[PDB]
Design a protein around this nucleic acid. Structure first.
Ligand SMILES: [Mg+2]
Ligand SMILES: [Mg+2]
Ligand SMILES: [Mg+2]
Ligand SMILES: [Mg+2]
Ligand SMILES: [Mg+2]
Ligand SMILES: [Mg+2]
Ligand SMILES: [Mg+2]
Ligand SMILES: [Mg+2]
Ligand SMILES: [Mg+2]
Ligand SMILES: [Mg+2]
Ligand SMILES: [Mg+2]
Ligand SMILES: [Mg+2]
Ligand SMILES: [Mg+2]
Ligand SMILES: [Mg+2]
Ligand SMILES: [Mg+2]
Ligand SMILES: [Mg+2]
Ligand SMILES: [Mg+2]
Ligand SMILES: [Mg+2]
Ligand SMILES: [Mg+2]
Ligand SMILES: [Mg+2]
Ligand SMILES: [Mg+2]
Ligand SMILES: [Mg+2]
Ligand SMILES: [Mg+2]
Ligand SMILES: [Mg+2]
Ligand SMILES: [Mg+2]
Ligand SMILES: [Mg+2]
Ligand SMILES: [Mg+2]
Ligand SMILES: [Mg+2]
Ligand SMILES: [Mg+2]
Ligand SMILES: [Mg+2]
Ligand SMILES: [Mg+2]
Ligand SMILES: [Mg+2]
Ligand SMILES: [Mg+2]
Lengths: 48, 28, 49, 80, 50, 115
RNA sequence: GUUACAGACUUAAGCAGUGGAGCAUGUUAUUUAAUUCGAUAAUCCACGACUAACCUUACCAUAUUUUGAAUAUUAUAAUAAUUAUAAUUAUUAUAUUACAGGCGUUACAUUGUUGUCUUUAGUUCGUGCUGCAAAGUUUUAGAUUAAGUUCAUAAACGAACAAAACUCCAUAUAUAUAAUUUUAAUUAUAUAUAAUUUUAUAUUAUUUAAUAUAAAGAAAGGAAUUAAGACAAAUCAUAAUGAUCCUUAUAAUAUGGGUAAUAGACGUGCUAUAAUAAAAUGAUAAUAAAAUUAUAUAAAAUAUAUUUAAUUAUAUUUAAUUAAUAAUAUAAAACAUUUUAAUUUUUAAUAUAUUUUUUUAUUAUAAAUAUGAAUUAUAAUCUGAAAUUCGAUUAUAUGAAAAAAGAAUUGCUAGUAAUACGUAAAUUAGUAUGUUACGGUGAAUAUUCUAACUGUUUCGCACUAAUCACUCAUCACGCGUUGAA
């Protein structure tokens, strides 16, 4: 496809006035939070 | 006579200079 | 209600099929939101005389 | 390149150093045609798993290197 | 040119997703009014898309 | 390296991204970039008239070109999903995915094959 | 392992096959570093997969990546666009955590979808009525249909989903349009009309219903649609998501190898085993349809294989057309002449003659071929950067098995089967014995008996995860209790 296509990121750039909500992202964040709460969060990544 | 056969059917190309061309010794 | 149309049953107007498989009057759809328990969906199907 | 015109299938190798000093050539090519310019050079041709030592034949001149490194193990049946 | 047609229909599909994303708003983290929208229908005349 | 999978920084394709898709897309981009060059090298190689040393050099160069320059390496993926089996070229979609789209009405002119 | 009807490709006829042979392909098993994963009774086995050289791939060996494909947070710095040497924004770079990512595990957590029962005729709704009630009626006395579809009778009356119908293809007719060079008007395509055909005379059984006859009509099919429930049927490998596990590794990239291994076994196919059947040939080119060609279709013609040339295969080079206009592409069986071993059922030397592409006479002519095409050797060509594992052609040699196939077993009632009849596309850079599609030529047969399996019913029922049901006793293992002695 055309890699330059409008994304949710841009929907903040174009229309700052409207406080949009990306639903899938929000859901993912909520899942992550739940995982953190119940001791099933991701282990901290090794750097070395 | 496998070498002889090879020489016969790759004669127009004439296959040293050829060795020098096709011998980069970096990758091994 | 009902999903048969009686305008086509006794008249000159005939039924037609959208994408050759959905009676014109029908319109079917579904949408699948994720729950705490997992995935679910909600089929809807209206007739429109 | 199989067809006689445009042949042979040439690959870059550490050939000249092997010729000067007997250092085996670890090939992972398996599709390089053997040439007259390397008969009596030690090759270590890949087998998928382990590199296979071969002193290139005087008769091998027409063939590919991968033809002399047999990839699969010889089949048998456990008579149970 | 069917390649171009395919590219157009891909674009249309991508725009639909974008529109869906836009449809949900927030009001200072107080009210989240989720405007429901239908699947879009894209009318490609020679002159213009609608 | 660390910051990217492949040598060149290419964009992500829009919509459905997948590791295999990413790999394919990059490869396609590199082919597009280095198409003319490859053709020229091939021409130089397969020439009875030209000097033999030059043709040999061209052949060596072609051999040494990477995985991502190769046209043969490109495989038509599904665009909606990331499958690579029964991928129809007229709508860059996998078999099941195409059917799903067709029945919905996503396709421009597709419908049930009744005869 | 029941009563009696009804049902159909169920059976019976019939036609062609499978099962024996070799090859192809899938599966199994075993092997392997890896032979990726799933499908595996009907309802798996050319299935997922409309093309595994690299890729695809998920598997293995060796290398090397570690905020990585995203989103957000916090900072430094650099470039470009816009404005009237400053600023606003957009991006990029380096980092920074939350994480990202996972074809890892569970379709016995799910979604959607699909298979089978199923184009089968069932499934419910109000409401009413019967029964203390679970339930029943409706949903059937009587028949009939393909049919819960239609008559009647009935404590029923309707209904919804099913059935049918509308739908698509094909057909007939009409109208419109096409300056009859994009022509095929014998066409294509929009819009109608047409039939689930009608009418009448008779002959059987009771006003109707089957048979027959007649006159009126082009009037005769196929496709899609496969309900409820069930099978914890299939799919977490289209995709997505729950839970769970991996986070320098179960995530990511490259080079090679593997998916193509081979004892036996199992399906599907293909090619065969020669004369109601194979091969040569057939240019005023016998006769089609459907579909593809800007990630192309490739015409004519030249050259080589090949002393003429044609055929077939490559190369040379692109004419035409991105298409009712050109190309893929002179369709093939058909039909006609010729040949054909097994076959001393023929040949060739003589004569012979009103069978002369032939006859007669007398001489000599002494279980796999002039079937089949597996297997292999060498040489070329094609695609691709690359053809060793591991692709496709052509040539010159090679010429296994196989003598119409055992118990059993598959498909098919008509433009169907059959066809040593061909044609096209999807998947490709490249390879179809597969898939999906098109026309060509075109049959044989026919219902009464029995197994099964769907809906109907009779009787039975100790079954209700519903006969893979339930269930009876010894013997064996432990721990009690109570007798005999
Ligand atoms: Mg039979
Ligand atoms: Mg057998
Ligand atoms: Mg056999
Ligand atoms: Mg799995
Ligand atoms: Mg398997
Ligand atoms: Mg993995
Ligand atoms: Mg995760
Ligand atoms: Mg996944
Ligand atoms: Mg299940
Ligand atoms: Mg399901
Ligand atoms: Mg009562
Ligand atoms: Mg009933
Ligand atoms: Mg009832
Ligand atoms: Mg129907
Ligand atoms: Mg005309
Ligand atoms: Mg059902
Ligand atoms: Mg199960
Ligand atoms: Mg399973
Ligand atoms: Mg899952
Ligand atoms: Mg890994
Ligand atoms: Mg690899
Ligand atoms: Mg396979
Ligand atoms: Mg099959
Ligand atoms: Mg024969
Ligand atoms: Mg030509
Ligand atoms: Mg034409
Ligand atoms: Mg002809
Ligand atoms: Mg024999
Ligand atoms: Mg033969
Ligand atoms: Mg033959
Ligand atoms: Mg490919
Ligand atoms: Mg046919
Ligand atoms: Mg019945």
């Amino acid at each position: 496809g055309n890699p330059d296509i409008l994304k949710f990121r841009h929907l903040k750039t174009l229309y700052p006035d409207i406080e949009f909500v990306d639903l899938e992202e929000q859901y993912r964040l909520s899942m992550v939070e739940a995982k953190k709460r119940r001791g099933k969060g991701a282990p901290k990544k090794m750097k070395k | 006579g496998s070498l002889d056969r090879f020489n016969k059917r790759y004669s127009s190309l004439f296959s040293t200079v050829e060795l020098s061309e096709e011998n980069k010794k970096k990758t091994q | 209600g009902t999903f048969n149309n009686k305008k086509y049953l006794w008249s000159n107007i005939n039924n037609n099929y959208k994408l050759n498989y959905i009676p014109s009057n029908h319109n079917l759809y579904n949408n699948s939101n994720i729950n705490k328990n997992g995935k679910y969906n909600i089929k809807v199907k209206l007739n429109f005389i | 390149s199989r067809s006689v015109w445009k042949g042979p299938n040439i690959v870059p190798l550490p050939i000249r150093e092997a010729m000067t000093k007997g250092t085996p050539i670890r090939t992972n090519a398996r599709a390089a045609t053997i040439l007259p310019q390397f008969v009596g050079l030690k090759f270590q041709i890949h087998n998928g798993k382990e590199y296979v030592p071969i002193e290139i034949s005087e008769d091998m001149v027409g063939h590919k290197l991968g033809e002399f490194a047999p990839t699969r193990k010889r089949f048998s049946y456990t008579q149970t | 040119n069917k390649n171009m047609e395919i590219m157009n229909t891909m674009n249309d599909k991508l725009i639909n997703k974008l529109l869906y994303k836009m449809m949900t708003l927030k009001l200072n983290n107080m009210n989240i009014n989720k405007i429901i929208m239908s699947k879009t229908i894209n009318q490609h005349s020679l002159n213009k898309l609608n | 390296m660390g910051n990217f999978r492949f040598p060149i920084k290419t964009k992500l394709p829009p919509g459905f991204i997948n590791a295999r898709i990413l790999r394919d897309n990059f490869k396609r981009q590199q082919f597009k970039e280095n198409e003319i060059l490859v053709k020229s090298l091939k021409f130089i190689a397969r020439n009875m008239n030209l000097p033999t040393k030059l043709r040999l050099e061209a052949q060596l160069k072609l051999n040494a070109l990477p995985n991502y320059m190769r046209s043969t390496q490109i495989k038509n993926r599904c665009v909606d999903s990331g499958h690579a089996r029964f991928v129809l070229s007229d709508f860059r979609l996998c078999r099941y995915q195409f059917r799903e789209n067709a029945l919905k009405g996503n396709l421009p002119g597709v419908k049930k094959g009744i005869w």
